[PDB]
């Protein structure tokens with residue numbers, strides 16, 4: 252007993268390219284409210300969609316050890332194709348080998364030629380199915396509606412090539428898409444069943460949480476008694492809100508459920524400490540392994556130069572291959588990608604965000620900032636040969652956030668600020684960063700509070716700061732102060 256269950260499609264692409272519009276058009280044109288997933292049936296078969304644009308949540312639920320997605324559809328606007336963020340989607344979908352279907356969206360415009368997309372995307376191992384072929388190219392239009400049926404046909408044709416094996420008789424097993432709390436009904440989950448069946452009444456374990464399905468809502472808001480092999484449902488009964496990547500399984504009784512939950516929490520507690528020591532760049536050589544890196548530069552040119560330089564490294568003892576690469580700060584999505592791929596973070600003139608910081612703290616993965624290009628490559632080659640491993644170089648002691656700017660016309664750029672980390676003192680170099688990208692690098696000019704010139708400010712104390720031979724310090728910047736460790 253075995254049948255083809257369903258394909259699961261995730262929509263990814265650049266911002267403002269039509270992900271939400273394409274996602275909504277199929278839902279509103281095939282047959283309110285949203286739960287996190289839905290499904291539509293065609294003549295050849297039925298396919299399910301996760302109504303959440305990807306490249307962010309696609310990896311978030313993958314780093315926990317679950318792969319609900321088996322088809323990824325890229326959307327690129329005909330007008331202006333392939334943005335420095337479609338490449339990020341390509342790398343995210345290539346880290347976990349999944350079929351990709353490309354669908355140009357904005358073809359209902361004068362300047363909407365698709366051939367520049369076809370050959371520009373061709374140099375990404377996404378060559379079209381007319382010259383070589385590993386991915387189709389169907390033109391759709393979310394607003395007008397043309398070409399969608401061909402898109403569904405292409406998705407189904409790509410899917411039928413894969414395994415598509417499931418048994419709609421075994422005890423249910425699946426993954427949770429999203430969870431939410433409500434004063435009525437308490438905690439609510441949006442589990443996606445993958446194999447078996449989830450008839451109402453079963454004893455359900457989801458990660459740490461456990462319970463039973465006292466109520467079940469379908470995707471359209473109507474209660475149902477049974478769940479298919481790949482039909483998303485919304486269950487009630489768990490004792491706490493689950494995460495977005497846990498596994499839902501059917502067990503026998505509550506005692507076994509509690510034993511498994513305690514074992515799972517113990518294992519999760521134990522796993523975290525291993526990455527905090529075995530995941531560092533100084534321990535990769537010790538214990539091929541194809542060392543992976545994630546790079547976040549500040550300017551595209553430096554990123555291209557660094558990728559070109561890091562090309563010819565690694566012959567027989569460990570190899571190097573970048574799995575990321577983008578312009579901007581270290582987004583939490585990049586940290587999730589590195590965690591799922593067991594890579595290491597490299598930050599060129601960029602700082603991690605709050606979410607990136609908390610993900611780094613939880614996963615305990617290596618994360619280092621670098622100032623000059625050649626230090627990155629020298630550290631990479633030194634770690635490849637595995638000779639030395641220590642911090643040094645620089646250590647940030649004190650970060651201050653500007654509040655307001657009152658630059659006086661008497662050749663001054665005095666900016667008010669409040670210290671949010673560490674302490675700031677006079678005779679150290681400073682570093683002004685806006686939008687997590689550094690803009691200036693130099694010393695100070697004045698750090699008085701009102702007129703005292705304290706030359707040392709404790710954390711949490713408002714003061715005024717002055718940058719030497721620099722201006723245009725807007726509101727919302729940060730000043731970090733560091734030491735060139737010798």
Ligand SMILES: Nc1nc2c(ncn2[C@@H]2O[C@H](COP(=O)(O)OP(=O)(O)O)[C@@H](O)[C@H]2O)c(=O)[nH]1
Nearest residue numbers: 266267268269270271272356357392393394395
């Ligand atoms: N002319 C045209 N415009 C489109 C089409 N699809 C989307 N758009 C435009 O895209 C905008 C919506 O962008 P949206 O999908 O929300 O961005 P996203 O969520 O980041 O993918 C709308 O204002 C539409 O004008 C299309 O097929 N034709």
